[PDB]
Short mmCIF file of all heavy atoms in Angstrom, two decimals:
data_model
loop_
_atom_site.label_atom_id
_atom_site.label_comp_id
_atom_site.label_asym_id
_atom_site.label_seq_id
_atom_site.Cartn_x
_atom_site.Cartn_y
_atom_site.Cartn_z
N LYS E 1 0.83 -1.19 -0.02
CA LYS E 1 0.00 0.00 -0.01
C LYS E 1 0.86 1.24 -0.02
O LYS E 1 1.79 1.37 0.81
CB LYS E 1 -0.89 0.04 1.22
CG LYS E 1 -1.68 1.38 1.34
CD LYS E 1 -2.48 1.44 2.65
CE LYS E 1 -3.03 2.88 2.86
NZ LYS E 1 -3.73 3.03 4.16
N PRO E 2 0.53 2.19 -0.91
CA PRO E 2 1.30 3.41 -0.89
C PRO E 2 1.27 4.17 0.45
O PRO E 2 0.26 4.09 1.08
CB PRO E 2 0.56 4.21 -1.97
CG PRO E 2 0.04 3.22 -2.92
CD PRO E 2 -0.38 2.10 -2.04
N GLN E 3 2.34 4.79 0.84
CA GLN E 3 2.39 5.66 2.03
C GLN E 3 1.55 6.90 1.88
O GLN E 3 1.12 7.23 0.75
CB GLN E 3 3.80 6.03 2.43
CG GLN E 3 4.48 5.11 3.43
CD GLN E 3 5.60 4.36 2.80
OE1 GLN E 3 5.48 3.74 1.74
NE2 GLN E 3 6.80 4.43 3.49
N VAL E 4 1.32 7.57 3.00
CA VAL E 4 0.49 8.76 3.07
C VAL E 4 1.17 9.93 3.78
O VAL E 4 1.81 9.81 4.77
CB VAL E 4 -0.80 8.43 3.86
CG1 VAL E 4 -1.84 9.53 3.62
CG2 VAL E 4 -1.33 7.06 3.45
N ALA E 5 1.00 11.11 3.18
CA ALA E 5 1.69 12.30 3.63
C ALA E 5 0.87 13.01 4.77
O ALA E 5 -0.01 13.79 4.52
CB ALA E 5 1.93 13.33 2.51
N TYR E 6 1.16 12.65 6.06
CA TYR E 6 0.48 13.28 7.18
C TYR E 6 0.98 14.67 7.53
O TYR E 6 2.16 14.96 7.10
CB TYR E 6 0.54 12.37 8.41
CG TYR E 6 -0.18 11.06 8.23
CD1 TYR E 6 0.47 9.95 7.89
CD2 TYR E 6 -1.56 10.95 8.37
CE1 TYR E 6 -0.12 8.65 7.72
CE2 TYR E 6 -2.21 9.73 8.24
CZ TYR E 6 -1.48 8.60 7.92
OH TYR E 6 -2.12 7.38 7.74
N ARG E 7 0.28 15.40 8.28
CA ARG E 7 0.71 16.74 8.72
C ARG E 7 0.46 17.00 10.25
O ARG E 7 -0.18 16.11 10.90
CB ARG E 7 0.00 17.88 7.90
CG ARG E 7 0.24 17.83 6.39
CD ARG E 7 1.67 18.17 6.06
NE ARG E 7 2.24 17.31 5.03
CZ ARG E 7 2.31 17.59 3.69
NH1 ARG E 7 1.83 18.77 3.25
NH2 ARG E 7 2.86 16.73 2.86
N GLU E 8 0.90 18.12 10.80
CA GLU E 8 0.76 18.35 12.18
C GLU E 8 0.26 19.78 12.46
O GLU E 8 0.59 20.69 11.74
CB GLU E 8 2.10 18.16 12.88
CG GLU E 8 2.73 16.71 12.61
CD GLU E 8 3.91 16.46 13.57
OE1 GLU E 8 4.43 17.34 14.21
OE2 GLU E 8 4.31 15.29 13.67
N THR E 9 -0.50 19.91 13.56
CA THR E 9 -1.00 21.22 13.97
C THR E 9 -1.38 21.19 15.46
O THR E 9 -1.31 20.18 16.13
CB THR E 9 -2.30 21.69 13.25
OG1 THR E 9 -2.48 23.10 13.39
CG2 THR E 9 -3.49 21.00 13.74
N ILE E 10 -1.73 22.41 16.01
CA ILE E 10 -2.12 22.53 17.35
C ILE E 10 -3.68 22.88 17.32
O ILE E 10 -4.20 23.23 16.24
CB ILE E 10 -1.33 23.53 18.13
CG1 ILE E 10 -1.89 25.02 18.06
CG2 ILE E 10 0.13 23.54 17.66
CD1 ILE E 10 -1.83 25.57 16.71
N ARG E 11 -4.35 22.83 18.44
CA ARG E 11 -5.78 23.08 18.48
C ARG E 11 -6.15 24.24 19.38
O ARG E 11 -7.18 24.92 19.19
CB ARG E 11 -6.48 21.82 18.98
CG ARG E 11 -6.29 20.58 18.13
CD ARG E 11 -6.40 19.30 18.96
NE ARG E 11 -7.76 18.86 19.02
CZ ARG E 11 -8.09 17.68 19.60
NH1 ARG E 11 -7.20 16.90 20.11
NH2 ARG E 11 -9.41 17.29 19.64
N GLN E 12 -5.35 24.45 20.38
CA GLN E 12 -5.50 25.61 21.33
C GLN E 12 -4.54 26.73 21.12
O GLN E 12 -3.31 26.48 21.06
CB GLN E 12 -5.28 25.13 22.79
CG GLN E 12 -6.34 24.22 23.33
CD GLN E 12 -6.04 23.85 24.73
OE1 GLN E 12 -4.93 24.06 25.24
NE2 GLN E 12 -7.06 23.29 25.47
N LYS E 13 -5.06 27.97 21.02
CA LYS E 13 -4.20 29.12 21.16
C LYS E 13 -3.46 28.99 22.50
O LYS E 13 -4.12 28.68 23.52
CB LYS E 13 -5.02 30.41 21.13
CG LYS E 13 -5.85 30.60 19.83
CD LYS E 13 -6.02 32.04 19.41
CE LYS E 13 -6.82 32.09 18.08
NZ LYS E 13 -8.25 31.80 18.30
N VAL E 14 -2.15 29.08 22.53
CA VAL E 14 -1.38 29.02 23.75
C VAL E 14 -0.80 30.41 24.09
O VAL E 14 -0.03 30.97 23.33
CB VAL E 14 -0.27 28.01 23.67
CG1 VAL E 14 0.65 28.10 24.92
CG2 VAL E 14 -0.85 26.61 23.61
N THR E 15 -1.12 30.81 25.33
CA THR E 15 -0.89 32.12 25.76
C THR E 15 0.61 32.36 26.14
O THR E 15 1.20 31.46 26.75
CB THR E 15 -1.70 32.51 26.99
OG1 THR E 15 -1.40 33.79 27.44
CG2 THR E 15 -1.48 31.52 28.17
N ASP E 16 1.13 33.53 25.84
CA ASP E 16 2.54 33.93 26.03
C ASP E 16 3.42 32.85 26.56
O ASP E 16 3.52 32.58 27.82
CB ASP E 16 2.56 35.18 26.96
CG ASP E 16 1.97 36.48 26.28
OD1 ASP E 16 2.67 37.03 25.44
OD2 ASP E 16 0.83 36.84 26.63
N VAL E 17 4.10 32.14 25.66
CA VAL E 17 5.15 31.16 25.97
C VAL E 17 6.48 31.80 25.82
O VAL E 17 6.61 32.79 25.02
CB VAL E 17 5.07 29.95 25.01
CG1 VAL E 17 3.72 29.31 25.09
CG2 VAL E 17 5.40 30.34 23.57
N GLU E 18 7.48 31.27 26.55
CA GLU E 18 8.72 31.99 26.68
C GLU E 18 9.96 31.23 26.18
O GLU E 18 10.16 30.08 26.49
CB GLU E 18 8.84 32.34 28.18
CG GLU E 18 10.00 33.36 28.42
CD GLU E 18 9.80 34.06 29.79
OE1 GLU E 18 8.64 34.27 30.19
OE2 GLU E 18 10.80 34.47 30.39
N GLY E 19 10.77 31.94 25.38
CA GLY E 19 12.06 31.45 24.88
C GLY E 19 13.15 32.32 25.30
O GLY E 19 13.01 33.54 25.36
N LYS E 20 14.34 31.74 25.57
CA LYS E 20 15.44 32.45 26.12
C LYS E 20 16.72 31.68 25.81
O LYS E 20 16.68 30.46 25.73
CB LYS E 20 15.27 32.61 27.61
CG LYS E 20 14.44 31.46 28.28
CD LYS E 20 15.03 30.11 28.01
CE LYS E 20 14.42 29.02 28.84
NZ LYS E 20 15.23 27.74 28.81
N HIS E 21 17.81 32.39 25.66
CA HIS E 21 19.08 31.73 25.32
C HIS E 21 20.20 31.91 26.38
O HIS E 21 20.46 30.99 27.13
CB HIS E 21 19.54 32.23 23.94
CG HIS E 21 20.68 31.43 23.37
ND1 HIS E 21 20.62 30.06 23.38
CD2 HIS E 21 21.81 31.80 22.82
CE1 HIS E 21 21.77 29.62 22.80
NE2 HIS E 21 22.53 30.65 22.52
N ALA E 22 20.78 33.15 26.42
CA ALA E 22 21.85 33.42 27.43
C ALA E 22 22.99 32.40 27.35
O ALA E 22 23.03 31.50 28.20
CB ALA E 22 21.22 33.47 28.82
N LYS E 23 23.94 32.60 26.50
CA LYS E 23 25.10 31.75 26.35
C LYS E 23 26.40 32.36 26.85
O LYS E 23 27.28 32.69 26.04
CB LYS E 23 25.29 31.36 24.88
CG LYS E 23 26.33 30.31 24.61
CD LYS E 23 26.79 30.40 23.14
CE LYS E 23 25.67 30.32 22.19
NZ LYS E 23 26.12 30.20 20.80
N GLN E 24 26.54 32.63 28.17
CA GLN E 24 27.89 32.92 28.70
C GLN E 24 28.60 31.59 28.80
O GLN E 24 28.37 30.78 29.73
CB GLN E 24 27.84 33.65 30.02
CG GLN E 24 28.81 34.89 29.89
CD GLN E 24 30.29 34.46 29.62
OE1 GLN E 24 30.75 33.39 30.09
NE2 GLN E 24 30.96 35.25 28.83
N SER E 25 29.48 31.28 27.85
CA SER E 25 30.15 30.00 27.78
C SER E 25 31.64 30.30 27.61
O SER E 25 32.45 29.90 28.48
CB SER E 25 29.60 29.14 26.68
OG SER E 25 29.64 29.77 25.42
N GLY E 26 32.02 30.95 26.55
CA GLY E 26 33.39 31.24 26.25
C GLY E 26 33.53 31.52 24.75
O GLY E 26 33.85 30.55 23.96
N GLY E 27 33.29 32.69 24.37
CA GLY E 27 33.30 33.17 23.00
C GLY E 27 32.29 34.27 22.75
O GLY E 27 32.11 35.11 23.62
N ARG E 28 31.68 34.23 21.67
CA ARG E 28 30.57 35.13 21.29
C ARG E 28 29.56 35.26 22.46
O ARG E 28 28.95 34.24 22.83
CB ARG E 28 29.91 34.72 19.96
CG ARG E 28 28.70 35.58 19.51
CD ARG E 28 28.84 37.06 19.83
NE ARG E 28 27.98 37.91 18.98
CZ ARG E 28 27.81 39.18 19.13
NH1 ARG E 28 28.37 39.83 20.11
NH2 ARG E 28 26.98 39.85 18.26
N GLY E 29 29.37 36.49 23.03
CA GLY E 29 28.44 36.76 24.07
C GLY E 29 27.11 36.00 23.90
O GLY E 29 26.83 35.04 24.58
N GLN E 30 26.23 36.53 23.05
CA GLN E 30 25.09 35.82 22.56
C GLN E 30 23.96 35.55 23.55
O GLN E 30 24.12 34.73 24.52
CB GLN E 30 25.59 34.48 21.95
CG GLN E 30 24.79 33.98 20.76
CD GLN E 30 24.80 34.99 19.63
OE1 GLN E 30 23.94 34.88 18.72
NE2 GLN E 30 25.73 35.95 19.59
N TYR E 31 22.86 36.25 23.35
CA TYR E 31 21.72 36.15 24.26
C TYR E 31 20.50 36.68 23.60
O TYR E 31 20.49 37.78 22.99
CB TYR E 31 21.98 36.84 25.57
CG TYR E 31 20.67 37.25 26.31
CD1 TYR E 31 20.20 36.52 27.36
CD2 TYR E 31 20.03 38.43 25.90
CE1 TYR E 31 19.08 36.93 28.00
CE2 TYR E 31 18.87 38.81 26.58
CZ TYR E 31 18.39 38.08 27.63
OH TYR E 31 17.26 38.46 28.28
N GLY E 32 19.40 35.93 23.61
CA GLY E 32 18.19 36.35 22.98
C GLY E 32 16.99 35.84 23.88
O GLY E 32 17.03 34.77 24.43
N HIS E 33 16.01 36.72 23.97
CA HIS E 33 14.79 36.35 24.76
C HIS E 33 13.56 36.75 24.06
O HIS E 33 13.50 37.88 23.54
CB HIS E 33 14.94 37.04 26.16
CG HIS E 33 13.76 36.86 27.08
ND1 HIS E 33 12.69 37.78 27.06
CD2 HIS E 33 13.51 35.91 27.99
CE1 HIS E 33 11.81 37.37 27.94
NE2 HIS E 33 12.32 36.26 28.48
N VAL E 34 12.58 35.87 23.99
CA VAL E 34 11.38 36.06 23.20
C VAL E 34 10.16 35.47 23.88
O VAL E 34 10.21 34.35 24.38
CB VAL E 34 11.52 35.54 21.75
CG1 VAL E 34 10.24 35.62 20.97
CG2 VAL E 34 12.56 36.28 21.02
N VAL E 35 9.04 36.17 23.81
CA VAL E 35 7.77 35.65 24.31
C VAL E 35 6.66 35.81 23.23
O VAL E 35 6.51 36.88 22.63
CB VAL E 35 7.35 36.56 25.53
CG1 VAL E 35 6.09 35.90 26.26
CG2 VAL E 35 8.47 36.61 26.57
N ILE E 36 5.94 34.74 23.01
CA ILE E 36 5.00 34.66 21.88
C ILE E 36 3.73 33.88 22.15
O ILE E 36 3.58 33.14 23.15
CB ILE E 36 5.67 34.01 20.67
CG1 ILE E 36 6.19 32.60 21.05
CG2 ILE E 36 6.72 34.89 20.12
CD1 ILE E 36 6.44 31.68 19.86
N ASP E 37 2.75 34.11 21.29
CA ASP E 37 1.46 33.42 21.31
C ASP E 37 1.38 32.50 20.05
O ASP E 37 1.51 32.98 18.91
CB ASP E 37 0.29 34.38 21.35
CG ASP E 37 0.40 35.34 22.51
OD1 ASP E 37 0.99 34.97 23.56
OD2 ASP E 37 -0.21 36.41 22.40
N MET E 38 1.25 31.18 20.27
CA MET E 38 0.96 30.21 19.22
C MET E 38 -0.54 29.91 19.07
O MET E 38 -1.14 29.53 20.07
CB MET E 38 1.69 28.90 19.45
CG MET E 38 3.03 28.99 20.05
SD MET E 38 4.03 27.50 19.79
CE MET E 38 2.72 26.23 19.84
N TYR E 39 -1.11 30.00 17.92
CA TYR E 39 -2.55 29.71 17.77
C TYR E 39 -2.94 29.06 16.46
O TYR E 39 -2.34 29.39 15.39
CB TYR E 39 -3.34 31.05 17.88
CG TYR E 39 -2.92 32.12 16.98
CD1 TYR E 39 -3.65 32.33 15.76
CD2 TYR E 39 -1.84 32.94 17.22
CE1 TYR E 39 -3.28 33.33 14.89
CE2 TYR E 39 -1.49 33.94 16.34
CZ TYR E 39 -2.16 34.12 15.17
OH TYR E 39 -1.81 35.15 14.30
#
């Protein structure tokens, strides 16, 4: 049987979710912080 091309999605709007980096390691300083709504 031939395969089928499935896809993916969400169902709920999700309220302000948070992303953050902060790489004090040893080299390029590098830090980013973001807050978003996925719907």
Side-chain angles (χ1 to χ4, degrees):
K1 173 186 170 183
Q3 265 113 310
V4 195
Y6 294 96
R7 300 293 139 97
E8 304 192 347
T9 197
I10 90 295
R11 301 152 86 174
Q12 289 180 348
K13 303 213 176 72
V14 172
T15 179
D16 290 284
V17 302
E18 193 158 329
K20 30 55 168 193
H21 192 47
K23 188 202 303 191
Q24 227 300 324
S25 55
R28 177 37 158 172
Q30 215 57 198
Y31 156 101
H33 175 271
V34 174
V35 189
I36 55 161
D37 305 332
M38 323 200 326
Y39 56 97

